[PDB]
Amino acid sequence: DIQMTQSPSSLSASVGDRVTITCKASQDVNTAVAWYQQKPGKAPKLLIYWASTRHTGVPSRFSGSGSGTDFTFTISSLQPEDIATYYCLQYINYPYTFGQGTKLEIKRTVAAPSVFIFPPSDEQLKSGTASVVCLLNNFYPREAKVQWKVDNALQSGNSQESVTEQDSKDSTYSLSSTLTLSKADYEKHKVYACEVTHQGLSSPVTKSFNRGE
Amino acid sequence: EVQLVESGGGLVQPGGSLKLSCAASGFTFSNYWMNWVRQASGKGLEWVGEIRSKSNNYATHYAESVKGRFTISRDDSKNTAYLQMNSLKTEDTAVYYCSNRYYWGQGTLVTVSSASTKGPSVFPLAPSSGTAALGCLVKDYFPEPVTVSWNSGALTSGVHTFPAVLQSSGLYSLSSVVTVPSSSLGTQTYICNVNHKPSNTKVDKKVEPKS
């Protein structure tokens, strides 16, 4: 079975940079190689086949080259919308084999998150559970610390976070943190706070509400 | 103009069976070799198999992980390709894509689990008292996926729909948020349209400031 090993597994580059990804076949595969782009949430799209032929309507800034065992995928000028995982595929023999993919990220200037806190709805409190949500909107880079406090007590092990992929225009991330408490625990405390630490903030930002109010 | 529409994906018992369909238009179907590829959540593309044209005696080739369990077939008169899946394992859990080698379909999720279908609750993330954030919490569902739109798809700018999180309960939760002008909060209606097709659950939730 023909191994396709891609390099590198992940890449960070600036907008306008020439980007290069290589794929090494474990045998001669002639020019029987395709490159696929998979953007966040979407099906993979064919960019290059026969190692170097561009599929119809694909932008000229995408190119492939190589023969036998060594293959190159090039973006001449990386654009914001090029956020994706790129895959090579071998197709001379069954079984066809994919590379493990190269996740392409964009470096840009620091952007501080906008922070929002959301109390649990009255509708949810009827169910015996309370979800408190902290939103960090449109920040770069990805590294961000969210701390939950309930009446000054740091909360640990009772929250989960989710982060979007890099936005296809502004190259920012967004992050939601959900603190899950019992209705009884929620009703027993007053002050609910999320504290956000980020390179873009001169010092940590806290958003809070008082349950009663 | 070229379309591949996958259907037949859903929740199935381990040891169970399922047939996927791929409805093709915009190309001379009978001349193309149809492929299935699958992707487990947060993982790479894995080739499933290929069926060649009538000229090639409808010859079929399979990945080793599926051979003996999965059958690819085609009906050229219907412009349709099929993936029959028998003796399903938890490891078969993935989004399944159909291709004519040049174009791929949207793909369809197969979940192999003994876990029960559960429909979500939808709760407001109400805006505070000039940019405002608001949203919908889609809580406690299985299996994936849910879809969220805002005002039936008329509101797309400033929308972030987060990846679903698997909770300790073994149920999913997902938040969708939008940032809007704070001046618009009094006047403009904001509705998140939630659909969990596996549980036949469709909700429209109006989100507004708490009084």
Numbering used by the authors:
A (entry chain A): 1 to 213
B (entry chain B): 1 to 129, 135 to 216
Quote the paper.
Covalent attachment of methoxy poly(ethylene) glycol (mPEG) to therapeutic molecules is widely employed to improve their systemic circulation time and therapeutic efficacy. mPEG, however, can induce anti-PEG antibodies that negatively impact drug therapeutic effects. Antibodies that bind to the repeating ethylene oxide repeats of PEG are termed “backbone-specific”, whereas antibodies that require the terminal methoxy group for binding are termed “methoxy-specific”. Here, we determined the first co-crystal structure of the humanized 15-2b anti-mPEG antibody in complex with mPEG, which possesses a deep pocket in the antigen-binding site to accommodate the mPEG polymer. Structural and mutational analyses revealed that mPEG binds to h15-2b via Van der Waals and hydrogen bond interactions, whereas the methoxy group of mPEG is stabilized in a hydrophobic environment between the VH:VL interface.
The final model of h15-2bmPEG was refined to a resolution of 2.08 Å with an R factor of 21.1% and an Rfree of 24.5%. The structure of h15-2bmPEG contains four copies of h15-2b Fab in an asymmetric unit, which all share nearly identical structures with small root-mean-square deviations (rmsds) of 0.161–0.417 Å for Cα atom superposition. Each of h15-2b Fabs shows that a hook-shaped mPEG fragment corresponding to 7 ethylene oxide subunits (about 300 Da) was bound into the pocket formed by the VH and VL domains of h15-2b Fab. It forms a van der Waals network with aromatic side chains in Y32H, W33H, and Y102H from the heavy chain, and Y36L, W50L, and Y91L from the light chain. In addition, the PEG backbone wraps around R101H. The terminal methoxy group of the mPEG fragment is buried in the VH:VL interface pocket, where V37H, W104H, L89L, and F98L create a hydrophobic environment to accommodate the methoxy group. It should be noted that the co-crystal structure of h15-2b Fab and mPEG was crystallized by using a 6:1 molar ratio of OH-PEG6K (15 mmol L−1) and mPEG2K (2.5 mmol L−1) as a cryoprotectant and an antigen, respectively. Taken together, h15-2b is more likely to form a complex with mPEG2K instead of OH-PEG6K. By contrast, the mPEG chain is clamped by aromatic amino acids in the paratope surface area of h15-2b to form the first CR-like structure and then bent into the VH:VL interface to form a second CR-like structure. Structural comparison of the anti-PEG and anti-mPEG Fabs reveals that the h15-2b HCDR3 loop coupled with these conserved residues assist to form a tunnel-like structure for capturing the mPEG deep in the VH:VL interface.
